[PDB]
CSV table of C-alpha atoms and ligand atoms in Angstrom, one decimal:
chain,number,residue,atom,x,y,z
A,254,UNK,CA,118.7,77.2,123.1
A,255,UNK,CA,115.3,76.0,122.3
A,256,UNK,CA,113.5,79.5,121.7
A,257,UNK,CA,116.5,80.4,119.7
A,258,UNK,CA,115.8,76.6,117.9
A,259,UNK,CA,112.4,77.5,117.7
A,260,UNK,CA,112.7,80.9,116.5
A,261,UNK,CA,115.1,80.0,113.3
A,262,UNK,CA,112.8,77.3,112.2
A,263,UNK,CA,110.0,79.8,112.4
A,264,UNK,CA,111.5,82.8,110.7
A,265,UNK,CA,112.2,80.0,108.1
A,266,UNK,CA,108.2,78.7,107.4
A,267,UNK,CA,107.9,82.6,107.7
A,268,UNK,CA,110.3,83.3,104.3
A,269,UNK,CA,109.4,80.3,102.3
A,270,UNK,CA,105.4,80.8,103.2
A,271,UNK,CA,105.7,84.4,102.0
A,272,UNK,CA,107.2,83.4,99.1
A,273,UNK,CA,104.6,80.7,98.3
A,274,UNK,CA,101.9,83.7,98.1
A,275,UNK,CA,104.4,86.0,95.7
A,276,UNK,CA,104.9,82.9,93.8
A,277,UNK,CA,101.3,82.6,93.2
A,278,UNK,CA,100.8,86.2,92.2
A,279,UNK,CA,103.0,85.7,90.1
A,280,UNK,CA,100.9,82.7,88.3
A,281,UNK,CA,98.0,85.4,87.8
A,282,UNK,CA,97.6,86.1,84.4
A,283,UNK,CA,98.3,89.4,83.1
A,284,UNK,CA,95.2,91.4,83.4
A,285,UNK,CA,94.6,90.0,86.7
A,286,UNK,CA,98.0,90.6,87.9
A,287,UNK,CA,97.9,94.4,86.6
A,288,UNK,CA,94.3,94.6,89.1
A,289,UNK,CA,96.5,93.3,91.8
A,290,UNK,CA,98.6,95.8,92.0
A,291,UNK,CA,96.6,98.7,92.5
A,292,UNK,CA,96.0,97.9,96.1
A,293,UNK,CA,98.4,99.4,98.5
A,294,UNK,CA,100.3,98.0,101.4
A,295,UNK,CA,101.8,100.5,104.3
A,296,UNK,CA,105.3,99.7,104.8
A,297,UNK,CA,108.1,99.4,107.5
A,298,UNK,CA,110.3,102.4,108.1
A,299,UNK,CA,112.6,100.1,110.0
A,300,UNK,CA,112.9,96.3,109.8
A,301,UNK,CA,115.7,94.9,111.3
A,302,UNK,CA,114.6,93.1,114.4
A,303,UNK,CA,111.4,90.7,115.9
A,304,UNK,CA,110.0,93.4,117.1
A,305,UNK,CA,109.1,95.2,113.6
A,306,UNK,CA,107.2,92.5,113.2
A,307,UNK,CA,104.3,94.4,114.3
A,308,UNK,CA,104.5,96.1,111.0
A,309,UNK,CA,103.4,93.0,109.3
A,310,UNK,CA,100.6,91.9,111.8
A,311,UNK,CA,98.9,94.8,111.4
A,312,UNK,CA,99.0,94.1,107.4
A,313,UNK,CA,98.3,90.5,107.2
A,314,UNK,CA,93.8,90.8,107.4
A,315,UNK,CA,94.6,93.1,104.1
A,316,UNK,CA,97.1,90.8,102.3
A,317,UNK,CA,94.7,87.6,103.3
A,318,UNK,CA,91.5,89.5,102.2
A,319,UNK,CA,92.8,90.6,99.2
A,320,UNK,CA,94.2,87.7,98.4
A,321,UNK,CA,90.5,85.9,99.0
A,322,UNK,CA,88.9,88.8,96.7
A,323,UNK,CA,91.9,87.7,93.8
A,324,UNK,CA,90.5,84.3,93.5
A,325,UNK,CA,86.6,85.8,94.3
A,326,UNK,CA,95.8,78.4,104.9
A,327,UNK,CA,99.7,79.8,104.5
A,328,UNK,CA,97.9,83.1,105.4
A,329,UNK,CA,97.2,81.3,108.8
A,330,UNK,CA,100.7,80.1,109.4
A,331,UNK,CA,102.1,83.5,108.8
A,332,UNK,CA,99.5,84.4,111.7
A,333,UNK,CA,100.7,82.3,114.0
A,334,UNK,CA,104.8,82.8,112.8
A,335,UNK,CA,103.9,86.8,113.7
A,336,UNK,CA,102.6,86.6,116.7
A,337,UNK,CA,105.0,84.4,118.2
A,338,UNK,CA,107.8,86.0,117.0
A,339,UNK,CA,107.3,89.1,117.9
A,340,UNK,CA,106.9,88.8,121.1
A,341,UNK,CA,106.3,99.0,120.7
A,342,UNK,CA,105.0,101.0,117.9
A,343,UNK,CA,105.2,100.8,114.6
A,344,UNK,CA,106.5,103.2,112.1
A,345,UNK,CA,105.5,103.1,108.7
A,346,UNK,CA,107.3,104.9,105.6
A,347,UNK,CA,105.6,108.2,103.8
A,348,UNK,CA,105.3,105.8,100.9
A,349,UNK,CA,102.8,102.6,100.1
A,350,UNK,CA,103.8,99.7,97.8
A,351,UNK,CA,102.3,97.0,95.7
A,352,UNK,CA,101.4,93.5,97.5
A,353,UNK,CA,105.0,92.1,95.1
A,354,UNK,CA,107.0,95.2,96.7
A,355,UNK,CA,105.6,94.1,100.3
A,356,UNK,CA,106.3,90.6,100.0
A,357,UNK,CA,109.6,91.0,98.8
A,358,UNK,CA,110.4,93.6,101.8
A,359,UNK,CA,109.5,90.7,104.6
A,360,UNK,CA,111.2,88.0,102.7
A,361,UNK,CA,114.1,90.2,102.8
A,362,UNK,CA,113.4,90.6,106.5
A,363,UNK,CA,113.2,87.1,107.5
A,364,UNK,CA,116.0,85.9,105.5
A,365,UNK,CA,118.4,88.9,106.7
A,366,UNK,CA,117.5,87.8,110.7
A,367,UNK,CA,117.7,83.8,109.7
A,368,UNK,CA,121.1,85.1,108.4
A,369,UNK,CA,122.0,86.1,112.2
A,370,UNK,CA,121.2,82.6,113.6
A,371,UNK,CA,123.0,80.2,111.1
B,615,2K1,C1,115.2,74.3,105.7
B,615,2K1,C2,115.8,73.7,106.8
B,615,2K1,C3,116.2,72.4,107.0
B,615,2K1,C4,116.8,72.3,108.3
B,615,2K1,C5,116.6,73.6,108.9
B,615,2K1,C6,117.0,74.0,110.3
B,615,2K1,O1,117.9,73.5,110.9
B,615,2K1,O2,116.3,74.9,110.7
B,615,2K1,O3,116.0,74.3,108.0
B,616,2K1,C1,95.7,95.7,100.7
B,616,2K1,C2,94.9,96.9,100.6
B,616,2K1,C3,94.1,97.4,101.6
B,616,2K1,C4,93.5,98.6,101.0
B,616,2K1,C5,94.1,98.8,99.7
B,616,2K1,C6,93.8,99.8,98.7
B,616,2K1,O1,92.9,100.7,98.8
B,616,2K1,O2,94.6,99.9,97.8
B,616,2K1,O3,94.9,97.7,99.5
């Protein structure tokens, strides 16, 4: 179908524009790197449908804000991606995580759903 056409290519700009960021933060030299990490991103409890989703909108002004204060576009593609997709309240773990541990949870995410549509 066309939404389900739609929604594979999405989920895919999703992953690969998620890792373009964690990619670049990992480019950061060392000292800037090690600032980085001390910010804090709340995390999913559950991720395993569109839906959850909403546990990434309501993270994406932090990542793109810190990410503007790191260097003092794919931010806005992931916007639109989110939105779409998903279309509920979200739960979020006990526990924050670095901006590399919350990247790498949604790229999991997308690639595990893109794995239910191939
Ligand atoms: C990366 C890539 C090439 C073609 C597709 C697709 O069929 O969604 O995805
Ligand atoms: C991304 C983000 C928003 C707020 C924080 C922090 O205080 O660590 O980090």
């Amino acid at each position: 179908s066309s939404s389900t056409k739609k929604t594979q290519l999405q989920l895919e700009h999703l992953l690969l524009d998620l890792q373009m960021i964690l990619n670049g933060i990992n480019n950061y030299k060392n000292p800037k790197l090690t600032r980085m990490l001390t910010f804090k991103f709340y995390m999913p409890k559950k991720a395993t449908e569109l839906k959850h989703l909403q546990c990434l909108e309501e993270e994406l002004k932090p990542l793109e804000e810190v990410l503007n204060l790191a260097q003092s576009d794919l931010i806005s593609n992931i916007n639109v991606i989110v939105l779409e997709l998903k279309g509920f309240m979200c739960e979020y773990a006990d526990e924050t995580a670095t901006i590399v541990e919350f990247l790498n949870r949604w790229i999991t995410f997308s690639q595990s759903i893109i794995s239910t549509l191939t």
